[PDB]
């Protein structure tokens, strides 16, 4: 419940090994979030889901269908 980080000493946040999208940004790759019994957890943020693209010198992927996305800016 007392935890040294590159941002400073962090107190009252439960350190967690699992990594999530950044909810509240603490700094130096650390974020915190409120989660389940509930506590503020602190974790190293996850940058996104990992993906080995299925590359080879003669394999191509071609899309057999589409979706019309509407996005709001």
């Amino acid at each position: 419940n007392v935890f040294q980080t590159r941002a400073g000493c962090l107190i009252g946040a439960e350190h967690v090994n699992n990594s999530y999208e950044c909810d509240i940004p603490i700094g130096a790759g650390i974020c915190a979030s409120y989660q389940t019994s509930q506590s503020i957890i602190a974790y190293t943020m996850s940058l996104g889901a990992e993906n080995s693209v299925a590359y080879s010198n003669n394999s191509i992927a071609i899309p057999t269908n589409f979706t019309i996305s509407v996005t709001t800016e």
Partner: protein, 228 residues
């Protein structure tokens, strides 16, 4: 066409649901309302400050004191209230330059996304841009960027060229692909396989040069049609 129209109509329906249910959605416009209200509240609260005068209120100084000392107490208020306004006007000039940069971007999105179709990646939303619709909002604009997103990938074997009778053939538009036993030419952004012909392909040189060329027949559409 009915599928594309239904996907468009459904995707426009989700915008109303998203903007109705999500409170943080218009947060870029609401922050521009909040920053200008916070700057005026800060400017007005600075009238309650003494700046070292006997009172924050100019009518206390002028009702209690008389000209030699009143003008010393008033000049402390003038000094601090003038510095309070210079701070507001400086931060509004810097904030106006940020809003102008956003208005120049919105004017460029109007011209290139609404009045056109954009080849610029991620300029008019994620996906290959189809079109955009402007909707007005308080102090801003909302663009509803319609985009084609490819959605059901399938793996194929591929080749850069085909060896026919010694000639190397390349696709005019599209890619050579195989289902595992037969070769087709398909457009790049949607799987629509065609038989490989002298119409959908062009020759350049011979089988010796190209690294990864494959031996397959290219159909000549004239040959049976010439006399049979």
């Amino acid at each position: 066409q009915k599928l594309i129209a239904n996907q468009f109509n459904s995707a426009i329906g989700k915008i109303q649901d998203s903007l109705s249910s999500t409170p943080s959605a218009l947060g870029k416009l609401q922050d521009v309302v909040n920053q200008n209200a916070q700057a005026l509240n800060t400017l007005v609260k600075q009238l309650s400050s003494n700046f070292g005068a006997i009172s924050s209120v100019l009518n206390d100084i002028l009702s209690r004191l008389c000209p030699p000392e009143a003008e010393v107490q008033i000049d402390r208020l003038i000094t601090g209230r003038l510095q309070s306004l210079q701070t507001y006007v400086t931060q509004q000039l810097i904030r106006a330059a940020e809003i102008r940069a956003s208005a120049n971007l919105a004017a460029t999105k109007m011209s290139e996304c609404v009045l056109g179709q954009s080849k610029r990646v991620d300029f008019c939303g994620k996906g290959y841009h189809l079109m955009s619709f402007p909707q007005s909002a308080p102090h801003g604009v909302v663009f509803l960027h319609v985009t084609y997103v490819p959605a059901q990938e399938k793996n194929f074997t591929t080749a850069p060229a085909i060896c026919h009778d010694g000639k190397a053939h390349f696709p005019r538009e599209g890619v050579f692909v195989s289902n595992g036993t037969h070769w087709f030419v398909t457009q790049r952004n949607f799987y629509e396989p065609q038989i490989i012909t002298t119409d959908n392909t062009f020759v350049s040189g011979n089988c010796d040069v190209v690294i990864g060329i494959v031996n397959n027949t290219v159909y000549d559409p004239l040959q049976p049609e010439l006399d049979s």
